[PDB]
Symmetry: C2
Subunit: 125 residues, 2 copies
């Protein structure tokens, strides 16, 4: 244990801050909550699924569950199928998906070096 | 353009979770809040300072300020000097400091591979 041990541990908070700044930027630009963004990303990754299934991947507090999905519908990112409720990506926002992904890619790229520097310090503890 | 793009972006949440898990592991073992751990580490990094000075390094919400610093006093990690309040590390706990830093080192090492794998995926976005 030395000065570098304590500095390295403190870089956990640095790295955390960088990640939270990325999310905060996406949230404000797209007027979405953290949960809404994670839902949309998960939908793109895994494809169409029921709300109960999406619950397994993203924590949505019961008090705002219907609000959360309604918000994604009103933004036109998703639509519902009723056979249980199944959500689908609205393929009419394909270009908007590409733009959002590029916005996140740029936000990440701007902090890549700093994030790797922090993690090097963390892992060297 | 696309995928593995979405996967990498989702690893932001994974990496965030890893960091929070490390803090949660420390919190449970040492019966300290996140703020208390950061205060203690900052104290070891920078040395003795006033509460006002510490509050610029670590976010301590005013409603939990008095219990945050009192908890550190009751755990015997620090003591107060009154000229504004100045806090000092209690050097009787030098061995405990070393043990805490080793505990943190182990919690990091436990997740180090996964964390670097997450950051590689993030940076590849």
């Amino acid at each position: 244990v030395n000065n570098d041990t304590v500095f390295g541990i403190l870089q956990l908070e640095t790295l955390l801050g960088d990640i939270n700044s990325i999310f905060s930027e996406i949230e404000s630009e797209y007027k979405m909550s953290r949960e809404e963004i994670l839902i949309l990303l998960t939908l793109w990754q895994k494809g169409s699924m029921t709300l109960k299934e999406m619950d397994r991947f993203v924590e949505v507090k019961p008090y705002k569950r219907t609000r959360t999905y309604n918000n994604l519908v009103e933004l036109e990112w998703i639509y519902k199928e009723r056979p249980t409720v199944i959500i689908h990506f609205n393929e009419k926002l394909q270009q908007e998906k590409v733009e959002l992904l590029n916005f996140i890619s740029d936000a990440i790229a701007s902090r890549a070096t700093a994030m790797q520097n922090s993690l090097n310090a963390i892992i060297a503890v």
